[PDB]
Design a protein around this motif. Structure first.
Motif, PDB file in Angstrom:
ATOM      1  N   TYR A   1       0.821  -1.201   0.000  1.00 53.32           N
ATOM      2  CA  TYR A   1       0.000   0.000   0.000  1.00 53.32           C
ATOM      3  C   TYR A   1       0.862   1.262   0.000  1.00 53.32           C
ATOM      4  O   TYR A   1       2.026   1.252   0.406  1.00 53.32           O
ATOM      5  CB  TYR A   1      -0.941   0.004   1.204  1.00 53.32           C
ATOM      6  N   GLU A   2       0.257   2.365  -0.453  1.00 53.76           N
ATOM      7  CA  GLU A   2       1.002   3.601  -0.684  1.00 53.76           C
ATOM      8  C   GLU A   2       1.552   4.233   0.592  1.00 53.76           C
ATOM      9  O   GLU A   2       2.474   5.051   0.501  1.00 53.76           O
ATOM     10  CB  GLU A   2       0.122   4.611  -1.416  1.00 53.76           C
TER      11      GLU A   2
ATOM     12  N   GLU B   1      -2.741  -2.513 -10.325  1.00 56.38           N
ATOM     13  CA  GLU B   1      -2.566  -1.270  -9.590  1.00 56.38           C
ATOM     14  C   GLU B   1      -3.982  -0.851  -9.222  1.00 56.38           C
ATOM     15  O   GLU B   1      -4.689  -0.241 -10.020  1.00 56.38           O
ATOM     16  CB  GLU B   1      -1.848  -0.220 -10.432  1.00 56.38           C
TER      17      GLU B   1
ATOM     18  N   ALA C   1      -7.019   0.569  -6.252  1.00 52.03           N
ATOM     19  CA  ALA C   1      -7.210   1.554  -5.206  1.00 52.03           C
ATOM     20  C   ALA C   1      -8.479   1.231  -4.436  1.00 52.03           C
ATOM     21  O   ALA C   1      -9.431   0.668  -4.984  1.00 52.03           O
ATOM     22  CB  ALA C   1      -7.294   2.976  -5.765  1.00 52.03           C
TER      23      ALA C   1
ATOM     24  N   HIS D   1      -8.313   8.368  -3.048  1.00 50.80           N
ATOM     25  CA  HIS D   1      -7.959   7.028  -3.489  1.00 50.80           C
ATOM     26  C   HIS D   1      -6.761   6.550  -2.683  1.00 50.80           C
ATOM     27  O   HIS D   1      -5.813   7.310  -2.456  1.00 50.80           O
ATOM     28  CB  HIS D   1      -7.633   6.987  -4.985  1.00 50.80           C
TER      29      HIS D   1
ATOM     30  N   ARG E   1      -3.963   3.704  -2.726  1.00 57.75           N
ATOM     31  CA  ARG E   1      -3.441   2.826  -3.769  1.00 57.75           C
ATOM     32  C   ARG E   1      -2.726   1.604  -3.199  1.00 57.75           C
ATOM     33  O   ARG E   1      -2.130   1.647  -2.123  1.00 57.75           O
ATOM     34  CB  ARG E   1      -2.486   3.594  -4.687  1.00 57.75           C
TER      35      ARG E   1
ATOM     36  N   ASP F   1      -0.428  -1.882  -4.836  1.00 55.82           N
ATOM     37  CA  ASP F   1       0.070  -2.699  -5.929  1.00 55.82           C
ATOM     38  C   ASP F   1      -0.027  -4.163  -5.520  1.00 55.82           C
ATOM     39  O   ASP F   1       0.574  -4.581  -4.520  1.00 55.82           O
ATOM     40  CB  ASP F   1       1.488  -2.289  -6.316  1.00 55.82           C
TER      41      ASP F   1
END
Length: 215
Positions: A91-92, A154, A156, A164, A166, A168
């Motif tokens: 996660y981002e 990818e 979200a 959002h 995100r 991966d």
């Protein structure tokens, strides 16, 4: 033809997120050739979950995918022996999850043994503060590598307030016998929590998935 037009599901998930252990069991039914399914999930240990249920829902079987006749179906070919999958989710905000599933079948029923672990989620971020609304519809890119089927996406999560969040996803799908390997293609997903009780100790979960070539 061991995959019937309507197949039942039974699963058990064990794991831990940010130090919190839990167990979730599930039962459901779906239509493998239509790419649809519904699951009823119950938290058996670790209730109430202190984190977003939306980080779990892709862990709760690509046998439930509508495959066109001109794309070999890696997943349905693998049965009755079955297949397993291994997945990384980054996660981002540097929360990270690993999940695995071993998928078998008996009669008209699939059985999943799922392991799910997550860590390093910020204690005030959207996962640990339960600020996610849903998984946004996403397209998974399927391709063969190292003799097995990979899927990258990818994706979200939608947050309260419109942001959002995100992640991966990278999945490796491993059939338990040799099957006809497909060319690169894509799987479009729609994931929806249809209903839930107060603390999401009970959850009804829906997926629709269909395979297609890009363009």
């Amino acid at each position: 033809s061991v995959i019937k037009p309507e197949m039942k599901i039974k699963l058990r998930m064990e794991g831990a997120v940010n130090g919190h252990k839990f167990v979730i069991e599930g039962e459901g039914i779906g239509k493998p050739y239509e790419g649809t399914q519904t699951l009823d999930l119950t938290v058996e240990e670790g209730a109430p979950l202190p984190f977003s249920y939306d980080i779990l829902t892709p862990a709760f079987n690509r046998a439930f995918t509508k495959y066109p006749e001109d794309i070999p179906d890696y997943f349905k070919q693998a049965f009755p022996e079955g297949y397993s999958w291994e997945r990384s989710m980054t996660y981002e905000d540097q929360g990270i999850c690993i999940a695995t599933s071993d998928i078998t079948m008996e009669g008209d029923c699939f059985f999943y043994e799922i392991r799910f672990d997550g860590t390093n989620f910020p204690p005030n971020g959207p996962v640990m503060q339960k600020k996610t609304l849903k998984l946004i519809d996403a397209t998974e890119k399927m391709y063969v590598e190292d003799g097995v089927l990979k899927g990258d996406v990818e994706m979200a999560l939608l947050l309260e307030g419109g942001g959002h969040y995100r992640c991966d996803f990278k999945t490796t799908y491993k059939a338990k016998k040799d099957v006809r390997l497909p060319d690169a293609h894509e799987v479009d997903h729609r994931t929806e929590i249809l209903s839930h009780d107060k603390d999401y100790n009970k959850v009804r979960l829906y997926e629709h998935a269909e395979a297609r070539y890009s363009g």
